[PDB]
Amino acid sequence: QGHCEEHLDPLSIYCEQDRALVCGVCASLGSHRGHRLLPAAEAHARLKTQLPQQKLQLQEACMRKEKSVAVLEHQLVEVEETVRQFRGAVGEQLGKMRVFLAALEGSLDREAERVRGEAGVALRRELGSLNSYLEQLRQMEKVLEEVADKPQTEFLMKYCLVTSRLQKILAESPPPARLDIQLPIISDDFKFQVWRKMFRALMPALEELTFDPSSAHPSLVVSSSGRRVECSEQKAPPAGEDPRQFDKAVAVVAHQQLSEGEHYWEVDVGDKPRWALGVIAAEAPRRGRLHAVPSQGLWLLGLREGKILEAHVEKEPRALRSPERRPTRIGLYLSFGDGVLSFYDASDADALVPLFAFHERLPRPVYPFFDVCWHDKGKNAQPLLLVG
Amino acid sequence: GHCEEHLDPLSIYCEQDRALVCGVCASLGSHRGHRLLPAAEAHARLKTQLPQQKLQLQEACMRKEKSVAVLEHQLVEVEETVRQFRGAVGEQLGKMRVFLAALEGSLDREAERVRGEAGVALRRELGSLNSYLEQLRQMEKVLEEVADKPQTEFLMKYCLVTSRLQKILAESPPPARLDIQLPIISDDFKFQVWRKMFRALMPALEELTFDPSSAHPSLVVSSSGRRVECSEQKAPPAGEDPRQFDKAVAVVAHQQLSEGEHYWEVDVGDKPRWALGVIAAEAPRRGRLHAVPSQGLWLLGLREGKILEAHVEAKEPRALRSPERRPTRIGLYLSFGDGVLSFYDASDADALVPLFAFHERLPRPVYPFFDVCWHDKGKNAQPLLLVG
Ligand SMILES: [Zn+2]
Ligand SMILES: [Zn+2]
Ligand SMILES: [Zn+2]
Ligand SMILES: [Zn+2]
């Protein structure tokens, strides 16, 4: 046909604006009256040359659709990954407690069996003692029935053996005892008692930790085992060869750098009366007397006179309510994910009690830092020990 | 039937050695100085013993067969009590096992939901993008095939192709990111789930209803016994029965608590003065009541809306460390078995906080006691509600 629907005249015109073929009348009185126009010939010539370029536009469009269908198929996997990571991480955290539970129940069930079997067999022993006795009394009744009708010489020797044997049985006979099994007492407090213990069980395994003697204040000696540090009363040859060496702080940091995750490590303080535990930022300065404040790179807990605890927070420290018994072991929890450094009185591993927690984004990495302090003319002689 | 050491007839019997001997043997030193008896008289004397001796034989034989019974019974009593233990741990430990299982299931169900929802979100936008691509590629095929065509059919194909591309370039957005809201699973998760577990340990909240017949005349109990307030109403001056409080504006519950474990929560809102706890049953309720355990009053009290006190045995009540958030619901744990009454800031059930706990043998029975305190001309008008 190649003609107009509305007018039936050859579509010899092309409208540059509406980009569609039109007929003569359409340009004259039609909706295409005032538009920018071209003859079909010049329009065919112009678009022959364009066609590689239009062909390229379509491919640019196809690329951009193919690019977007890529992003979605990647996302469609990231969903199953993120769900697995979540659904997996949950099971793992819960698994800590589930294990703790099964461990505790096993330990009790083993003490159940131990008392069961052990108290069990003492009875089966004394049971045999009574069956042999009854069986002996049974024969003695049988002899006594047959002896009533015996010759003089035979009756007499039987009755002596019988009455003299029954004599010995009566002194050898023990009175029965009542059943007394000592099983662990299971109270109303029980469900709480386990719950309290679960806290220690939530923590990650104690970080492998060893003092760095190459950071040690000269008066400080580190044990060969790498887990004991002491403040000696002897002359100290100072060494300013390394900026990591402590000169005025009387302290030492650990070998291990801490960069990500969650870590827990306990420190036995015993009856030491002045010390400070915590962590140091890596590039923080170690030379001179340092004010204990996080802005100086110091996340620090210190004890004075063995009775007053203080948290070296952002000049004056915060005096913590001293626990009812002086603590003999401190725990340090550290999580970069959550930006937290928690201190615990770990003297009783079954009942951990928090003392204080920093709650800020920490600059990673940090070094477990330990301030032994001066032996103070013989008084602060007690060592610092790493539980492990 | 004669003596071994020499052939002489045993017609002699020795009362001391209780053994037949021969004549020579009574003259021989082996049995010489002993008290002796003829064998005939000994046979006559022991014939009469035989009825009495037979009774002695069975007299002991009876008590031994009964004693093998008591011990044979103990062998099951041991296996039963051990089972009772092993069962008892299962239940208390299961109390956490169920909690943990359920929390996992709830999280597992929300994750699956978020998963499937994103599942169709992408597969939808995906399927649409492909259909665009399939038509977009189809258009390339038109553009190659038509390049050599006559003017009129070529041109209208170029219009039709470019006009479809017109619409497609409008309907589709840039790739855009993946948006999943999952609960954030941090290192802190195991800790929050642990705290939440605490409240789950407590027994089901006691059915408790205020007993209006104990009530101070100026307080009205409403809502099926679970609401009391002190209204500024016409108050009958007092009742006659000692069961009614006349001076303290207080009310006890109907229910008597005599044995076991009990947990009940009391919504206090921003009521600024109150006292919660328990009163011994026959302990006095008439007159000004001094708050001390020796008078049957175990009480945790709030004053000025900010200071909590523990009415322990002293002249002045004991000022508690008040938490940084005003408590809006108080919890009460009770065990006669362990002799404990525990107060908790139960404002947030996922994290109960201990407030104070008495640790003494409790007089049974006891009444949940509630001191509303005077309405103070409109200030302390707020009620006490029992959660359930
Ligand atoms: Zn036309
Ligand atoms: Zn037009
Ligand atoms: Zn003889
Ligand atoms: Zn004799």
Numbering used by the authors:
A (entry chain A): 83 to 396, 398 to 471
B (entry chain B): 84 to 471
Give the article text.
Human TRIM72, a tripartite motif family protein primarily found in striated muscle, consists of four domains: the RING domain, B-box domain, coiled-coil domain, and SPRY domain.
In the structure, we observed electron density for TRIM72 B-box, coiled-coil, and SPRY domains (BCC-SPRY), but the RING domain is not observed despite the fact that we used full-length protein for crystallization. The overall shape of TRIM72 BCC-SPRY dimer is similar to that of a clothes hanger. Residues (122–230) form a long α2 helix which in turn forms an antiparallel dimer with the α2′ helix from the other molecule. The short α4 helix (residues 270 to 283) again forms an antiparallel dimer with α4′ helix from the other protomer. Both ends of the coiled-coil domain are covered by a B-box domain. The two globular SPRY domains sit above the coiled-coil domain at the midpoint, with one on each side. In the TRIM72 structure, the α4 dimer packs tightly with the center region of the long α2 dimer to form an X-shaped junction with three layers of hydrophobic interactions. Zinc atom 1 (ZN1) is coordinated by C86, H89, C105, and C108; zinc atom 2 (ZN2) is coordinated by C97, D100, H114, and H117, the use of an aspartate instead of Cys/His for ZN2 coordination is similar to what has been observed for TRIM5α B2-box. One direct result of TRIM72 B-box dimerization is that the C242 residues from two TRIM72 molecules are brought to a close distance of 30 Å, possibly facilitating disulfide bond formation.
